[PDB]
Amino acid sequence: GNFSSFMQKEIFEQPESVVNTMRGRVNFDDYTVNLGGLKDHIKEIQRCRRLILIACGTSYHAGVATRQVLEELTELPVMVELASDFLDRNTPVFRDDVCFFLSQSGETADTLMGLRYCKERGALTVGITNTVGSSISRETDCGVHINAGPEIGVASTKAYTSQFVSLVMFALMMCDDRISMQERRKEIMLGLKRLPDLIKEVLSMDDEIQKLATELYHQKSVLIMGRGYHYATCLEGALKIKEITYMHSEGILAGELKHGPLALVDKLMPVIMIIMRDHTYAKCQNALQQVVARQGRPVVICDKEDTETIKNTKRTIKVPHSVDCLQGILSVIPLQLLAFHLAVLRGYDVD
Amino acid sequence: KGNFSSFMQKEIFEQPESVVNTMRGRVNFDDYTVNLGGLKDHIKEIQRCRRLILIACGTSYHAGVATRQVLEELTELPVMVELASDFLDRNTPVFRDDVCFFLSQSGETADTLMGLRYCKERGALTVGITNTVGSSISRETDCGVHINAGPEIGVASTKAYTSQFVSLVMFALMMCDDRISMQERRKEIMLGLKRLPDLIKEVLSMDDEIQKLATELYHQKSVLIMGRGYHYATCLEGALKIKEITYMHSEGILAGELKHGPLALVDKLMPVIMIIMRDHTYAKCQNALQQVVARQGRPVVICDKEDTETIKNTKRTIKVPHSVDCLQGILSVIPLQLLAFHLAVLRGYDVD
Numbered sequence: 040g041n042f043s044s045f046m047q048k049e050i051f052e053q054p055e056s057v058v059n060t061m062r063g064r065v066n067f068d069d070y071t072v073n074l075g076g077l078k079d080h081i082k083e084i085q086r087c088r089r090l091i092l093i094a095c096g097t098s099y100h101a102g103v104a105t106r107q108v109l110e111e112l113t114e115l116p117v118m119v120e121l122a123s124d125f126l127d128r129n130t131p132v133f134r135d136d137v138c139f140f141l142s143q144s145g146e147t148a149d150t151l152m153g154l155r156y157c158k159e160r161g162a163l164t165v166g167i168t169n170t171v172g173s174s175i176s177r178e179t180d181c182g183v184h185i186n187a188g189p190e191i192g193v194a195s196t197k198a199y200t201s202q203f204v205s206l207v208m209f210a211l212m213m214c215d216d217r218i219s220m221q222e223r224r225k226e227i228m229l230g231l232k233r234l235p236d237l238i239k240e241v242l243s244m245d246d247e248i249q250k251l252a253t254e255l256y257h258q259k260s261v262l263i264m265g266r267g268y269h270y271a272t273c274l275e276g277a278l279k280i281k282e283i284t285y286m287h288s289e290g291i292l293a294g295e296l297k298h299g300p301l302a303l304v305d306k307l308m309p310v311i312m313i314i315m316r317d318h319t320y321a322k323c324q325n326a327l328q329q330v331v332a333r334q335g336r337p338v339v340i341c342d343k344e345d346t347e348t349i350k351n352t353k354r355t356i357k358v359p360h361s362v363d364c365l366q367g368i369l370s371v372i373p374l375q376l377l378a379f380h381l382a383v384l385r386g387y388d389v390d
Numbered sequence: 391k392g393n394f395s396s397f398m399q400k401e402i403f404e405q406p407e408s409v410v411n412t413m414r415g416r417v418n419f420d421d422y423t424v425n426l427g428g429l430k431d432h433i434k435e436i437q438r439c440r441r442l443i444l445i446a447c448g449t450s451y452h453a454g455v456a457t458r459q460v461l462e463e464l465t466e467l468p469v470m471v472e473l474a475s476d477f478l479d480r481n482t483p484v485f486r487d488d489v490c491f492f493l494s495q496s497g498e499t500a501d502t503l504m505g506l507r508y509c510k511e512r513g514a515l516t517v518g519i520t521n522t523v524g525s526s527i528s529r530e531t532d533c534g535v536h537i538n539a540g541p542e543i544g545v546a547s548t549k550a551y552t553s554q555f556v557s558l559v560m561f562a563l564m565m566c567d568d569r570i571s572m573q574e575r576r577k578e579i580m581l582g583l584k585r586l587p588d589l590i591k592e593v594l595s596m597d598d599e600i601q602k603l604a605t606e607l608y609h610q611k612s613v614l615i616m617g618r619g620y621h622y623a624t625c626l627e628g629a630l631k632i633k634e635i636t637y638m639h640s641e642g643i644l645a646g647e648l649k650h651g652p653l654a655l656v657d658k659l660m661p662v663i664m665i666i667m668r669d670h671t672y673a674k675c676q677n678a679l680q681q682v683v684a685r686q687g688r689p690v691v692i693c694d695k696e697d698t699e700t701i702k703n704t705k706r707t708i709k710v711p712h713s714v715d716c717l718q719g720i721l722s723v724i725p726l727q728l729l730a731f732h733l734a735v736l737r738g739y740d741v742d
């Protein structure tokens with residue numbers, strides 16, 4: 040290791056781990072995706088009727104991050120479940136379900152108990168893990184190794200974005216026979232090529248993320264607001280800032296703001312809004328104005344080329360542009376960096 | 391409001407009557423049957439559907455979370471509960487054999503209404519659970535249930551939430567009325583529904599105890615409300631109540647997700663309310679209480695009044711009467727409704 044913290048290293052490693060996940064799998068010449076661990080099951084999975092993503096903590100947030108593109112490209116119901124809640128409810132599961140179990144370690148008890156429950160119902164089980172030979176990796180019918188390398192830190196960082204990328208790769212396989220989605224998977228794979236270079240462009244803003252931490256050093260709460268593709272971003276951002284900085288960070292769905300949580304907004308409540316260039320732009324802007332009109336001052340994580348938000352907002356963490364279903368990868372990096380720097384400022388052991 | 395200053399307070403205290411009104415002409419406690427006459431032109435088709443989708447905003451979404459489990463149990467169907475804004479953002483796949491419920495006090499909430507029109511275009515059977523006769527959601531659905539809570543004049547939903555809760559329970563009871571193996575389960579639930587109004591009066595009797603808890607808490611900036619299973623909705627709804635009218639930074643936390651990051655926020659200084667009721671998640675909840683006290687947290691525990699071990703081993707507890715596990719969520723949310731109110735009065739705001 041070269042850096043101070045394991046977490047810190049693992050964060051800056053992301054332009055390399057992403058490439059490792061796509062290694063011997065993606066091909067940018069002939070637009071083919073191929074996930075070896077699923078090559079014996081991919082046709083049976085393609086005939087299934089629902090996808091269930093079961094996980095705890097940040098591995099659950101990755102499901103949330105890729106729910107939408109999975110629905111769009113499989114045209115199947117996609118259900119994302121927190122493993123503890125899944126087991127408490129005795130969730131209905133059937134033989135034509137494909138159940139995914141996302142777990143970095145492959146040993147989290149609830150996610151594994153969920154695997155056994157699903158297997159007993161006769162569902163097709165799929166592992167998205169980072170630990171070869173782990174319990175979740177062995178006991179599932181098939182699976183994918185995200186290949187992000189070892190993770191020794193307490194907060195997941197590279198594991199999250201590589202869980203992300205692999206689920207997007209799975210989505211690209213599922214829709215490979217459909218004529219109408221040929222262009223759509225082209226633009227997604229172009230973005231997967233540009234991804235590591237653009238992740239490095241985000242790592243360039245460590246300066247601005249370091250000094251944003253010092254302003255929020257004394258603060259006790261921070262509301263992270265996000266829509267659609269970035270609901271996961273805000274949930275995951277809020278979870279890091281909880282876990283390692285011990286500040287009350289809560290992710291809030293932007294569309295739910297007017298239904299109650301808006302009350303929390305005043306001049307003294309710091310807000311981080313994720314307003315990016317996708318189909319929900321106008322609605323994210325309505326959420327901004329609702330916050331401003333309540334006298335809040337939001338640090339907006341926005342697009343680099345979004346002129347009417349860079350000038351119109353005091354603090355902006357400008358992020359490079361990618362295709363809508365990949366932006367979640369880029370826009371979460373500033374928040375995992377902010378979680379690290381606040382932890383340092385308060386004099387805590389990130390590891 | 392006869393004696394009350396607040397509409398919200400009046401409406402919370404109205405809940406022993408509004409629950410009766412919700413069940414009037416639907417639950418028969420003389421022969422223990424359930425019928426929702428607003429559905430009878432579609433009930434055959436609904437009974438043959440292959441998935442329920444609940445679509446709503448805010449506390450109406452919470453009413454969905456609060457009833458997801460008994461709906462899965464009694465229907466044996468997948469039940470997916472969706473926040474309406476995010477439902478539209480994703481173009482969620484919907485099919486002709488889906489039954490889509492639209493939970494809305496007002497019956498006009500824009501996202502919930504657009505979710506309705508989206509589901510119709512795809513051929514799903516649509517059902518309105520509203521508190522407003524002749525509203526858009528009531529008119530545009532194929533069938534409906536009016537929850538009969540009465541006008542809600544407060545800004546925060548109280549009686550409507552719990553009426554929506556009972557409504558969805560009634561629907562669940564109806565869906566399993568032909569299963570021999572479930573007759574005792576549903577007789578249990580209906581006995582619970584019949585006792586429920588008096589058990590709310592007993593909860594409302596702790597208005598004093600809840601007042602004095604608010605005096606100890608109202609200076610605080612944050613409070614974590616933790617709970618599991620049936621009471622996950624209780625903690626999300628209580629967290630939204632405390633946000634909406636007190637402006638305190640409350641947040642609902644799934645008890646089973648504590649050990650995955652949120653537990654690091656717990657110490658001597660962070661207020662915590664845990665929900666520990668006598669149901670199948672008891673041991674899992676106690677585990678959650680052990681790791682909160684192990685990190686120096688001194689939580690207020692909402693619990694069963696005859697749970698002698700939680701009452702003795704914790705200083706401040708709110709002692710709630712026991713009912714059926716799938717109804718308990720009605721009793722355990724009320725103290726949080728009242729706390730939100732007394733917490734807000736102490737600070738001094740115009741609750742309505």
Ligand SMILES: O=C(CO)[C@@H](O)[C@H](O)[C@H](O)COP(=O)(O)O
Nearest residue numbers: 096097142143144147194195650
């Ligand atoms: O990493 C974090 C938070 O930074 C945890 O929330 C884990 O994501 C969770 O404990 C599941 O762990 P795995 O099941 O993925 O090993």
Ligand SMILES: O=C(CO)[C@@H](O)[C@H](O)[C@H](O)COP(=O)(O)O
Nearest residue numbers: 448449450494495496499546547
């Ligand atoms: O009352 C509250 C919170 O106490 C609101 O969150 C409403 O539940 C929401 O705005 C949806 O309203 P309806 O669609 O239920 O009318």
